[PDB]
Amino acid sequence: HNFGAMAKEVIEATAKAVNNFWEGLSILEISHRSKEWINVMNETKALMKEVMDIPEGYEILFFGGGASLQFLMVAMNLLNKKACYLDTGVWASKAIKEAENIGEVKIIGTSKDKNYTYIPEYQIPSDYDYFHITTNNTIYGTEIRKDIESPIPLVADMSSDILSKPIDISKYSLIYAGAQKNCGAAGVTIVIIKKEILGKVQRKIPIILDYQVHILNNSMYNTPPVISIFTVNQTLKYIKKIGGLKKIQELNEEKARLLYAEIDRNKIFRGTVRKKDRSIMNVCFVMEEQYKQLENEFSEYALQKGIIGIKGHRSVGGFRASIYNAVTIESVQALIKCMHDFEQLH
Amino acid sequence: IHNFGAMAKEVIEATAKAVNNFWEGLSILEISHRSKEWINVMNETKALMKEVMDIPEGYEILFFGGGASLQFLMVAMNLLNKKACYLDTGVWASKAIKEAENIGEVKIIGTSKDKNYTYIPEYQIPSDYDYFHITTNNTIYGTEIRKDIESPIPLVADMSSDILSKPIDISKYSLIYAGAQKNCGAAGVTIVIIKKEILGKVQRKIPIILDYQVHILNNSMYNTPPVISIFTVNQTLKYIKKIGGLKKIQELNEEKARLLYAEIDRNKIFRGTVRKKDRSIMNVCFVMEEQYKQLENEFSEYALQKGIIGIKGHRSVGGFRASIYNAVTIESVQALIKCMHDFEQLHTH
Numbered sequence: 001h002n003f004g005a006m007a008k009e010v011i012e013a014t015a016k017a018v019n020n021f022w023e024g025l026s027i028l029e030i031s032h033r034s035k036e037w038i039n040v041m042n043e044t045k046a047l048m049k050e051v052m053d054i055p056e057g058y059e060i061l062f063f064g065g066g067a068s069l070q071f072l073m074v075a076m077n078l079l080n081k082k083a084c085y086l087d088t089g090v091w092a093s094k095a096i097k098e099a100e101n102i103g104e105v106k107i108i109g110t111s112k113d114k115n116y117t118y119i120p121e122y123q124i125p126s127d128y129d130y131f132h133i134t135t136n137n138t139i140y141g142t143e144i145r146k147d148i149e150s151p152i153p154l155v156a157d158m159s160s161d162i163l164s165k166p167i168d169i170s171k172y173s174l175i176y177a178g179a180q181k182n183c184g185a186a187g188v189t190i191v192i193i194k195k196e197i198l199g200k201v202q203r204k205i206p207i208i209l210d211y212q213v214h215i216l217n218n219s220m221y222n223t224p225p226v227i228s229i230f231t232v233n234q235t236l237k238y239i240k241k242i243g244g245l246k247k248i249q250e251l252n253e254e255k256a257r258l259l260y261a262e263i264d265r266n267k268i269f270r271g272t273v274r275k276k277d278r279s280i281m282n283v284c285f286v287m288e289e290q291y292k293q294l295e296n297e298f299s300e301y302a303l304q305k306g307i308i309g310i311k312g313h314r315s316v317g318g319f320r321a322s323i324y325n326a327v328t329i330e331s332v333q334a335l336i337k338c339m340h341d342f343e344q345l346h
Numbered sequence: 347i348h349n350f351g352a353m354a355k356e357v358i359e360a361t362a363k364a365v366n367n368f369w370e371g372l373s374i375l376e377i378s379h380r381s382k383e384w385i386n387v388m389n390e391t392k393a394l395m396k397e398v399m400d401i402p403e404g405y406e407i408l409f410f411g412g413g414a415s416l417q418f419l420m421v422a423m424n425l426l427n428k429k430a431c432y433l434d435t436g437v438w439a440s441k442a443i444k445e446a447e448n449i450g451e452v453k454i455i456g457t458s459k460d461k462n463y464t465y466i467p468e469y470q471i472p473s474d475y476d477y478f479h480i481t482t483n484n485t486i487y488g489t490e491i492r493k494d495i496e497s498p499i500p501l502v503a504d505m506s507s508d509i510l511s512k513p514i515d516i517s518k519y520s521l522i523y524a525g526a527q528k529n530c531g532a533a534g535v536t537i538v539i540i541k542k543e544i545l546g547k548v549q550r551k552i553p554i555i556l557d558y559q560v561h562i563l564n565n566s567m568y569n570t571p572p573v574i575s576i577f578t579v580n581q582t583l584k585y586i587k588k589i590g591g592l593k594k595i596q597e598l599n600e601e602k603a604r605l606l607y608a609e610i611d612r613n614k615i616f617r618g619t620v621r622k623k624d625r626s627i628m629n630v631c632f633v634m635e636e637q638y639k640q641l642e643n644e645f646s647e648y649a650l651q652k653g654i655i656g657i658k659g660h661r662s663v664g665g666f667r668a669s670i671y672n673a674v675t676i677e678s679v680q681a682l683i684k685c686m687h688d689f690e691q692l693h694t695h
């Protein structure tokens with residue numbers, strides 16, 4: 001019924017563009033070498049600059065594949081001697097592992113000890129090539145709050161929180177996001193990168209994995225993921241129309257605030273995650289121990305009521321409500337009402 | 347208007363429909379790739395490709411984001427242990443070779459670089475290399491390979507510009523791949539068809555995201571796949587089946603090329619760049635005769651005024667290139683021919 005929604009303006013625009021993008025030609029059949037497309041590339045780049053307040057010295061790239069390709073690219077392009085990572089979840093852990101296959105990694109802090117229910121403390125050593133974080137840990141519902149000011153280059157996987165709120169881009173040397181959550185449709189990954197960090201690795205880098213080759217060719221070194229890039233272009237237009245990332249944040253903060261209040265009020269349920277590290281985007285909650293056996297009964301009940309895709313990833317069990325930008329206040333209230341009624345029957 | 351670029355209309359409409367409402371009011375852009383609705387598409391696309399292409403048992407089908415260039419690297423990382431060999435028949439072939447050389451030892455066993463890749467060289471395949479890589483249709487130069495290739499070592503092939511233009515004997519190949527923006531689908535997806543028993547034989551470490559095994563173990567959803575581009579491949583396969591398979595698709599293409607080459611050869615304004623026996627049926631390259639060399643630009647503008655678009659050659663050849671993908675109609679080819687025939691800069695009657 002409702003739970004991975006994309007804004008409707010963006011769906012309609014995309015469909016329109018499939019029927020007729022330019023002069024009768026479908027967006028699926030135009031050349032990516034044509035000027036019509038190059039213009040979209042550049043406007044999308046200018047839109048992301050505007051909407052996110054990207055300063056000078058940062059390049060914007062679009063890659064096919066996902067955040068996982070970037071786990072590798074980050075390491076191959078910046079890990080010369082050694083790099084450090086914060087282990088806050090499945091995605092953080094998968095980044096760390098890919099990087100370890102390339103060279104030396106120090107894990108400077110982890111919350112693996114308590115099923116990643118919290119964000120650990122850490123001291124950033126000043127002699128590593130870069131420091132990599134995962135800002136929203138999608139599976140465990142933790143996010144990072146502290147304004148991070150790294151003495152070395154700061155790399156961040158924002159797959160699950162890019163375009164949910166404004167950020168200070170200048171604090172980061174490289175930001176990336178698989179784009180299927182907020183931000184766009186499956187098939188594209190965004191990379192925003194402070195060019196001056198490249199060129200400092202003695203290892204050879206394959207051409208297709210070399211950020212410089214991509215920068216020099218404005219992300220069309222080879223065929224880019226046109227339609228997914230288009231959906232990013234529209235999503236940026238909609239965020240601007242509706243008054244920017246300040247506003248997007250307020251609506252999200254609210255949606256999360258209601259849902260966490262319901263979780264905490266309701267005796268059937270409890271949030272898994274420490275209050276202070278609670279993510280605004282992925283809201284994880286399990287059955288109270290007393291009602292543990294009702295877990296499956298409630299899934300079926302939510303499904304009967306038209307709520308879909310709130311099952312947690314396996315490792316945590318319980319539930320996870322992913323409150324992406326395009327999920328409405330109304331879809332959140334119907335969850336709350338489903339949870340409330342579940343409590344009142346028991 | 348006549349369109350060198352066209353996608354079949356059934357496929358465009360189906361994709362648009364699926365963007366509005368794929369399943370129970372939800373757009374294909376908003377469903378979960380972890381949902382059963384999507385998994386079913388993944389599998390039906392796989393079963394369709396198996397059916398339509400007659401893929402034997404022991405071959406896996408994978409879908410990758412990115413393009414054929416990512417596969418240049420994956421191929422080498424997954425199969426080049428000691429050394430491999432390549433045939434140099436063009437820009438794409440040369441780019442594959444280069445990426446592979448950055449990984450390990452490559453013997454280039456034949457090249458047509460000597461004559462601006464106007465022909466397909468002879469070669470002897472050495473039996474002690476890990477694999478032999480070819481580019482079956484050389485998109486920029488308009489050559490394709492004809493000989494039925496029977497390799498004594500694993501045969502890898504970049505079919506980006508000819509996949510789904512005709513039936514092939516899949517059993518001859520150990521790995522086939524295709525960036526999919528030319529016949530078979532829309533930009534954002536690359537197909538890989540792979541004989542699984544060739545994997546596992548490399549001493550080098552392979553990054554997880556580049557390891558074909560990890561992908562196969564997860565049915566191409568090790569991570570988020572390119573959903574919409576995969577859907578367009580799913581529809582393209584349905585259309586090919588409806589209209590009677592790859593045998594039919596071939597006849598129509600062979601015809602379209604046959605007409606256009608006859609016109610190129612008949613017309614004194616123009617000449618085909620490529621040796622006759624190696625002529626590609628997909629990418630038709632032709633330049634101005636030397637006598638009419640200065641008319642090159644005048645003719646581009648003339649074609650454009652007449653509604654023909656995107657026939658300009660890649661820089662390295664100049665001249666022209668008519669890409670006669672499956673979805674380009676006989677009628678669009680005739681209007682090119684009629685445009686060419688209106689060479690009254692000569693006064694032929």
Ligand SMILES: Cc1ncc(COP(=O)(O)O)c(C=O)c1O
Pocket residue numbers: 065066067068069091134136137138157158159160178179568569570571
């Ligand atoms: C924070 C985070 N990082 C990385 C990924 C992996 O994304 P992809 O499927 O684009 O490789 C995801 C996917 O959900 C995610 O939420």
Ligand SMILES: Cc1ncc(COP(=O)(O)O)c(C=O)c1O
Pocket residue numbers: 222223224412413414415416438481483484485504505506507525526
């Ligand atoms: C034969 C061949 N190989 C490789 C490529 C590169 O594919 P991609 O742009 O999908 O990297 C192309 C692009 O046309 C091609 O025609």
Ligand SMILES: [Cl-]
Pocket residue numbers: 088089090091092136137138139140
């Ligand atoms: Cl996670």
Ligand SMILES: [Cl-]
Pocket residue numbers: 435436437438439483484485486487
């Ligand atoms: Cl070529």
